[PDB]
């Protein structure tokens, strides 16, 4: 049994990380302007 509140805060940070990677990609990728 893995405590729910941990499944969440872990899956949670996990999303802020991927969605944050996207925001970084906005000042570097092709979607850049440079």
């Amino acid at each position: 049994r893995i405590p729910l509140w941990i499944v969440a805060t872990v899956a949670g940070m996990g999303v802020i990380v991927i969605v944050g990677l996207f925001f970084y990609g906005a000042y570097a990728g092709l979607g850049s302007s440079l």
Partner: peptide, 28 residues
């Protein structure tokens, strides 16, 4: 270069200081 090293720790810190309490079971 990669001070993501920082965030990471101070990040698992918040949940830690309650988890250890889930272990020492008490006052949440």
């Amino acid at each position: 270069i990669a001070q993501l090293t920082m965030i990471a720790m101070i990040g698992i810190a918040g949940p830690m200081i309650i988890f250890l309490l889930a272990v020492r079971r008490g006052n949440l």
